[PDB]
Coordinates of C-alpha atoms and ligand atoms in Angstrom, one line a residue:
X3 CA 33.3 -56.5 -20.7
X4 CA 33.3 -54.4 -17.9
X5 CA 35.1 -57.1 -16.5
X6 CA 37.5 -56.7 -19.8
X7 CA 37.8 -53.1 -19.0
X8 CA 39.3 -53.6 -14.9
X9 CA 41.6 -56.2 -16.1
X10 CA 43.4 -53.4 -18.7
X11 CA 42.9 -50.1 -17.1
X12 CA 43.6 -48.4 -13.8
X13 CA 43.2 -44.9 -12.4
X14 CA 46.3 -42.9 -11.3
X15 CA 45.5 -39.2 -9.8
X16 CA 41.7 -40.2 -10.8
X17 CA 42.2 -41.0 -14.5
X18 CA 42.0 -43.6 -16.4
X19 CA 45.0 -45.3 -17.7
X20 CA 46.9 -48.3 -19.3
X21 CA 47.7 -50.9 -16.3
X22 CA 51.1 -51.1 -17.7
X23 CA 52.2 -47.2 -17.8
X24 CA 50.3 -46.9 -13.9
X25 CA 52.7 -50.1 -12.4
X26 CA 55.9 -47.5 -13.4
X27 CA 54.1 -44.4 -13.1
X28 CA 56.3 -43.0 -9.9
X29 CA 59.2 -42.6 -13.3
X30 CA 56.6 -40.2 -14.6
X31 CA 56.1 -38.5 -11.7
X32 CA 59.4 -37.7 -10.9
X33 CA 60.5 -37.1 -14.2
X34 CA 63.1 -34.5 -14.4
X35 CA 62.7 -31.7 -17.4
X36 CA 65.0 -29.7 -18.9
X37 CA 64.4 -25.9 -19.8
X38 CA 64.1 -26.5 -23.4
X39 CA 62.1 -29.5 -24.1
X40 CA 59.2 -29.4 -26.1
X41 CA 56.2 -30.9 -24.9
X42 CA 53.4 -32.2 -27.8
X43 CA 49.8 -32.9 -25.6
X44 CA 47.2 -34.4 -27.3
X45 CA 43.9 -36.4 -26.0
X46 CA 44.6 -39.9 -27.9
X47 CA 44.1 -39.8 -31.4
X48 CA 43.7 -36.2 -31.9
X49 CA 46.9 -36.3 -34.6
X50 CA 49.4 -36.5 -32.1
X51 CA 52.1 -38.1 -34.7
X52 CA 50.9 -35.5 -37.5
X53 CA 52.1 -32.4 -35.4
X54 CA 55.2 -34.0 -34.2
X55 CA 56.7 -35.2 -37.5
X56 CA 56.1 -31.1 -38.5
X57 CA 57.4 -30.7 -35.4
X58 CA 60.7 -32.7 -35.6
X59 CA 61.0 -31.0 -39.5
X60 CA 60.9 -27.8 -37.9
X61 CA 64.1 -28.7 -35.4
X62 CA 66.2 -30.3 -38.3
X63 CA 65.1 -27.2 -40.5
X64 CA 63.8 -29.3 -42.8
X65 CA 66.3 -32.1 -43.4
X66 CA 64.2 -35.1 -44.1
X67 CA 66.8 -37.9 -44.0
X68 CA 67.5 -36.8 -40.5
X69 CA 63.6 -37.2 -39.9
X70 CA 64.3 -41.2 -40.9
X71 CA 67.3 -41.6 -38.8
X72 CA 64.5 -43.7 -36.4
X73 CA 61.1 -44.6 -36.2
X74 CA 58.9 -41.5 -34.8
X75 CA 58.1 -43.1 -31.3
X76 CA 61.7 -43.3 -30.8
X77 CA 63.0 -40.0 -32.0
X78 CA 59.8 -38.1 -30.0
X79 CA 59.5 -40.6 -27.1
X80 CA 56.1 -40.9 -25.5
X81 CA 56.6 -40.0 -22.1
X82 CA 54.6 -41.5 -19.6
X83 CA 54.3 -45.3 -21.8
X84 CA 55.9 -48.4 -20.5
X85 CA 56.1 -52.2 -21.7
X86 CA 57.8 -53.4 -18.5
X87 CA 61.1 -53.6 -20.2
X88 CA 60.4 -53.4 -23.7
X89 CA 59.3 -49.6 -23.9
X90 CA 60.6 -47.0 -21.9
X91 CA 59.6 -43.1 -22.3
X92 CA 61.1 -42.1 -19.7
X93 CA 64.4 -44.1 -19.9
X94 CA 64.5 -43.2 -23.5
X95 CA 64.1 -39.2 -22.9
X96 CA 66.5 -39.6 -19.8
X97 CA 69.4 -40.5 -22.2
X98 CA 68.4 -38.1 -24.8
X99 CA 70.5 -35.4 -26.2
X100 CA 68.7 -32.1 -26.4
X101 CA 66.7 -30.4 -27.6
X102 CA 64.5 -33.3 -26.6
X103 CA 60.6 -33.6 -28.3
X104 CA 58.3 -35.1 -25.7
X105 CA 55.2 -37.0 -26.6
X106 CA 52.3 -37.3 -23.4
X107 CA 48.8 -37.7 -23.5
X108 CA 48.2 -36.4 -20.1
X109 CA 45.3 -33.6 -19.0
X110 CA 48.0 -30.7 -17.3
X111 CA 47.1 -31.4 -14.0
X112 CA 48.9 -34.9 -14.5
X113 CA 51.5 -33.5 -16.4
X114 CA 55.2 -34.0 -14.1
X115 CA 55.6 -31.1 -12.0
X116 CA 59.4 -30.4 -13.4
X117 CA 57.8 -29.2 -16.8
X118 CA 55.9 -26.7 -15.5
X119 CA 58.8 -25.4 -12.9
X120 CA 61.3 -25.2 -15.7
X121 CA 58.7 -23.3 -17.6
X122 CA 59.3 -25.6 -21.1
X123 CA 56.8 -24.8 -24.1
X124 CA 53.7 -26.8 -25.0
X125 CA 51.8 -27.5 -27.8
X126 CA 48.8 -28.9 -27.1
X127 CA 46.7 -30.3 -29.9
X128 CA 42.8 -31.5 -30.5
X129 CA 40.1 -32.7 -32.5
X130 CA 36.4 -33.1 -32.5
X131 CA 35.4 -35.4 -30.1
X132 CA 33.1 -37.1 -32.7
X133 CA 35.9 -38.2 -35.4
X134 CA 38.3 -39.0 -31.7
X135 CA 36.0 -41.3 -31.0
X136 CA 35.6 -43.3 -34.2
X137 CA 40.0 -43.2 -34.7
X138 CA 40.0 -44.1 -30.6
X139 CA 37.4 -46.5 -31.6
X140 CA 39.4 -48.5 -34.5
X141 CA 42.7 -47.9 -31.9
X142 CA 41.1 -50.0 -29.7
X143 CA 40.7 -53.0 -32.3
X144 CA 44.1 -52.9 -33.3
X145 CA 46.5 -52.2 -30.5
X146 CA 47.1 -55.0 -28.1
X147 CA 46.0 -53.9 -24.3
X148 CA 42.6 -52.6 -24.6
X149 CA 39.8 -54.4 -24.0
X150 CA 36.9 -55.7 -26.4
X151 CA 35.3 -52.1 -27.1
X152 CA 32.2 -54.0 -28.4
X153 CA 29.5 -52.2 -30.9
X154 CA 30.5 -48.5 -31.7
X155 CA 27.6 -47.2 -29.7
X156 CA 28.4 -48.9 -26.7
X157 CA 32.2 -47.6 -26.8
X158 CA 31.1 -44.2 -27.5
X159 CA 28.5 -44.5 -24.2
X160 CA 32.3 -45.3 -22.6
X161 CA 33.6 -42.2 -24.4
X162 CA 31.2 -39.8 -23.4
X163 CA 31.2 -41.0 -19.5
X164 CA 35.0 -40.9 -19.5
X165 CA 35.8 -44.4 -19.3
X166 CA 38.4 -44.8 -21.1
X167 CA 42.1 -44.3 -21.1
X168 CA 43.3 -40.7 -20.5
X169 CA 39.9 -40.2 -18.7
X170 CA 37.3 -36.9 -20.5
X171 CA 38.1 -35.6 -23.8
X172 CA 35.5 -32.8 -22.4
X173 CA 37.8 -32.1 -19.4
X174 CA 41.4 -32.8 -21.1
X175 CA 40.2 -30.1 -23.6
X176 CA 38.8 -27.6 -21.3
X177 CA 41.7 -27.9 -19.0
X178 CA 44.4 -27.6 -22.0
X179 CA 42.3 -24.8 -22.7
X180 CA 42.4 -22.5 -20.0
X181 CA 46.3 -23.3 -19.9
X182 CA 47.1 -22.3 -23.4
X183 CA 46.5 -19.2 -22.4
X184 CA 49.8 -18.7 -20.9
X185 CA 52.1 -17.7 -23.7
X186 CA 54.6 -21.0 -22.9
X187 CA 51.4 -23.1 -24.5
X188 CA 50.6 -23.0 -28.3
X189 CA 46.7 -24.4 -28.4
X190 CA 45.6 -25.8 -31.9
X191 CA 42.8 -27.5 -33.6
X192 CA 43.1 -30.6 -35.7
X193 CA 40.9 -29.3 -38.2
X194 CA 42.7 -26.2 -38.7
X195 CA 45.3 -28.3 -40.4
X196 CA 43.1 -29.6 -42.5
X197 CA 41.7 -26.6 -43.5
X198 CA 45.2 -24.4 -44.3
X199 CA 48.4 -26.2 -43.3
X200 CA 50.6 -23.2 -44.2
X201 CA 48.9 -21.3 -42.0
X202 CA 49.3 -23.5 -38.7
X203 CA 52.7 -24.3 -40.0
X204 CA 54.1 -21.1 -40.3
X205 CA 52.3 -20.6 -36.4
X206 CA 54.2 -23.6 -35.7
X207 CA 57.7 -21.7 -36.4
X208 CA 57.3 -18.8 -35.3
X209 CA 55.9 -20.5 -31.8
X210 CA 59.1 -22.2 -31.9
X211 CA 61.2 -19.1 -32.6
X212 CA 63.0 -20.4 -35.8
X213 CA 62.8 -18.7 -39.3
X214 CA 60.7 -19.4 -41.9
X215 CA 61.2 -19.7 -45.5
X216 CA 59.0 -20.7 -48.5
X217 CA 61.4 -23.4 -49.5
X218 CA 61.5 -25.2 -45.8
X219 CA 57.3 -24.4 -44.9
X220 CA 56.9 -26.5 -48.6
X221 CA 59.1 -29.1 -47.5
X222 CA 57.0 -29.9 -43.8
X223 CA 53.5 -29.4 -45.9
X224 CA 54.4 -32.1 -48.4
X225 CA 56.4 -34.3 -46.1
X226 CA 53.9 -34.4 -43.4
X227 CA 50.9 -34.3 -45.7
X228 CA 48.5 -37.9 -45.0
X229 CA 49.5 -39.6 -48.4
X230 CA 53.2 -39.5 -47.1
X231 CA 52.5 -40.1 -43.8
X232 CA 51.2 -43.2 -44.4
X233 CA 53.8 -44.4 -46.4
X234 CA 56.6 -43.7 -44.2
X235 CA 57.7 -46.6 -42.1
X236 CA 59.1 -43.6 -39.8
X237 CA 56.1 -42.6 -39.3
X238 CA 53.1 -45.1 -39.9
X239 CA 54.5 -47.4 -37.0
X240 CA 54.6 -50.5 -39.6
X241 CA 57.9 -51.6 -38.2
X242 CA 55.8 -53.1 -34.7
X243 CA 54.9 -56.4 -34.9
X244 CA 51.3 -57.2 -35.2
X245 CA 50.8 -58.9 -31.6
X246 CA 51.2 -54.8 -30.6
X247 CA 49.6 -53.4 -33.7
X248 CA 47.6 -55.6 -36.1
X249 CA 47.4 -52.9 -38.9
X250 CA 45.4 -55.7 -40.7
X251 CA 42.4 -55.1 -39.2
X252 CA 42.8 -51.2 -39.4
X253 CA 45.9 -48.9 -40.4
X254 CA 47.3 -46.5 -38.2
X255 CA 47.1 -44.4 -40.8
X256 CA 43.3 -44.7 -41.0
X257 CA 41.0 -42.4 -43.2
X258 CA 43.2 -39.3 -42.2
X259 CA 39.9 -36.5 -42.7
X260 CA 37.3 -34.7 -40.8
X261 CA 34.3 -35.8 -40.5
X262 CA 34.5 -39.6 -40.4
X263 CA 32.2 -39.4 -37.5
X264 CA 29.7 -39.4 -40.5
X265 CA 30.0 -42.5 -41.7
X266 CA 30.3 -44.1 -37.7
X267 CA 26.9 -42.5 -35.7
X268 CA 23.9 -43.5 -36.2
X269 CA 21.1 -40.6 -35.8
X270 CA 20.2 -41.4 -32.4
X271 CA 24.0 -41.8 -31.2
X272 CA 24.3 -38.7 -32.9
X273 CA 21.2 -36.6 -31.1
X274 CA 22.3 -38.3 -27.7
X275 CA 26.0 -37.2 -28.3
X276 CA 25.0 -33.8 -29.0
X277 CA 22.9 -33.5 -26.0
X278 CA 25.4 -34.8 -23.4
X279 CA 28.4 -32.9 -25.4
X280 CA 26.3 -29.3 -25.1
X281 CA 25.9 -30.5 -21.2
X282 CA 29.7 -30.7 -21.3
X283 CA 31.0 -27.9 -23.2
X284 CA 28.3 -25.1 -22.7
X285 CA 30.3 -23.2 -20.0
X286 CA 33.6 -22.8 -22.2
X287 CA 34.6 -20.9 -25.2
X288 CA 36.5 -23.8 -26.5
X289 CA 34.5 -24.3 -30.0
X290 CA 35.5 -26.8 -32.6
X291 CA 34.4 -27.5 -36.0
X292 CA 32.7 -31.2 -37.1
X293 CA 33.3 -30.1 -40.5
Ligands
A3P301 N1 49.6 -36.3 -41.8 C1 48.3 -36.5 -41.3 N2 47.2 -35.8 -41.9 C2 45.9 -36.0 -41.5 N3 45.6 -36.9 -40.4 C3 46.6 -37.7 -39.8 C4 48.0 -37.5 -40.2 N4 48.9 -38.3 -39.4 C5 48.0 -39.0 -38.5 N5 46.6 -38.6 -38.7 C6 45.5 -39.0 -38.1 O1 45.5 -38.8 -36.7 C7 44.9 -39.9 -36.1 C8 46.0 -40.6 -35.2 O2 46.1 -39.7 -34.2 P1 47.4 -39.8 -33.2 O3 48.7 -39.5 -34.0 O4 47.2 -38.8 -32.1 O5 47.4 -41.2 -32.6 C9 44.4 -40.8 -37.1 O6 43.1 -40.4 -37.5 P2 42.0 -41.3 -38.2 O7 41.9 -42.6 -37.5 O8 40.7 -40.5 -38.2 O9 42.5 -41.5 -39.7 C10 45.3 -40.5 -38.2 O10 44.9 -40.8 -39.5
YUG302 O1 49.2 -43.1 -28.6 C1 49.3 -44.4 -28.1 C2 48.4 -44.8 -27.0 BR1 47.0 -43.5 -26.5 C3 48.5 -46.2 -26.5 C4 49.5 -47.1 -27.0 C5 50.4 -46.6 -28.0 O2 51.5 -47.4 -28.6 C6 51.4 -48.7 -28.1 C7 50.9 -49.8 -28.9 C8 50.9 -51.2 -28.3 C9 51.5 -51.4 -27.0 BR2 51.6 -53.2 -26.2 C10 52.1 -50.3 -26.2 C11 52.0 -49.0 -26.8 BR3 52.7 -47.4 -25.9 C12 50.3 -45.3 -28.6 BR4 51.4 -44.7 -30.0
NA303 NA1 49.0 -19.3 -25.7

């Protein structure tokens, strides 16, 4: 098990990553930006594909047969990921036309130095780190490359200590935090669109300086609503073979709510959770919603 973990993850710059991104990771790190792409930061599973398919909408103004030209993790191409030579996010940004959409999981400090010099928007995006855990949780099960997580309390004793890929929720958060206070950084909450999807939707236009329009912000909400979502090969990543994702065992698109944490921790996971995250989170005015 702990064993399990060494064999499939590896730091780089003190975090915890997927052995296969870390062997190519001097691509990431010299990874050349260009002064208007669009970077989309999440911590993993934080509904990273929701807010780039409103994204991508946004950028073809609504056009949703140009949203099905390809698969999502080709037409936003997740940065620093790498199969060897079956995956490429850099290679596959590199010969991009603009505007290019980048996908990245990365805490800022990590982030490639060229975004930040060519000044290139962000949006960052998170969730409660409850219902993370349970969807990171289920991830583990069916994506190929992670280790046996075991019993749900013992992965989230994994979660809570950072031991995972991508390293702290608790200090991705905070440090995304304190960045999207610039005004190149759009911060939002997970359960905020959940809660009113017009709202964050229209934030997400005008963030991205395009015009918005009844007809267009009905389009994204209904397009990119869960139901959808989870029907679109585009989107639901049904296309990869089950040796990478076994969607068998558990969907991609899972339960798609808040609050699924609920139904995962037990009592005591969740009194021992609460007492480590208030440890955590006590210094920052980062506040989420578990409901
Ligand atoms: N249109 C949508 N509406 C609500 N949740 C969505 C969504 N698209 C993806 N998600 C949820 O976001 C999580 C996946 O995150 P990511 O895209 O960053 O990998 C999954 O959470 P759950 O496992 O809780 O259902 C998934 O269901
Ligand atoms: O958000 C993701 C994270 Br975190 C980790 C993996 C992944 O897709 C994959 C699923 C299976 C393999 Br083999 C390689 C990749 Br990349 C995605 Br989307
Ligand atoms: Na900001």
């Amino acid at each position: 098990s702990e064993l399990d973990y060494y064999e499939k993850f590896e730091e780089v710059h003190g975090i915890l990553m997927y052995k296969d991104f870390v062997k190519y990771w001097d691509n990431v790190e010299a990874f050349q930006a260009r002064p208007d792409d669009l970077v989309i930061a999440t911590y993993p599973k934080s509904g990273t594909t929701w807010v780039s398919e409103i994204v991508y909408m946004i950028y073809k103004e609504g056009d949703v047969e140009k949203c099905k030209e390809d698969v999502i993790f080709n037409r936003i191409p997740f940065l620093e990921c790498r199969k060897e030579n079956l995956m490429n996010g850099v290679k596959q940004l590199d010969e991009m036309n603009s505007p290019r959409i980048v996908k990245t999981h990365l805490p800022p400090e990590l982030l490639p130095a060229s975004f930040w010099e060519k000044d290139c928007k962000i949006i960052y995006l998170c969730r409660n780190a409850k219902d993370v855990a349970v969807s990171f949780y289920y991830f583990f099960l069916m994506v190929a490359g992670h280790p046996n997580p075991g019993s749900f309390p013992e992965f989230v004793e994994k979660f809570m200590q950072g031991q995972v890929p991508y390293g702290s929720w608790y200090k991705h958060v905070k440090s995304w935090w304190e960045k999207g206070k610039s005004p190149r950084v759009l911060f939002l909450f997970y359960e905020d669109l959940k809660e009113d999807i017009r709202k964050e939707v229209i934030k997400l236009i005008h963030f991205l300086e395009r015009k918005p329009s009844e007809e267009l912000v009905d389009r994204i909400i209904h397009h990119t609503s869960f139901q959808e979502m989870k029907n679109n090969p585009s989107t639901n990543y049904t296309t990869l073979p089950d040796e990478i994702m076994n969607q068998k065992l558990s969907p991609f698109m899972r339960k798609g709510i808040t609050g699924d944490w609920k139904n995962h921790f037990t009592e005591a996971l969740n009194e021992k959770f609460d007492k480590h995250y208030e440890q955590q989170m006590k210094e920052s005015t980062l506040k989420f919603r578990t409901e």
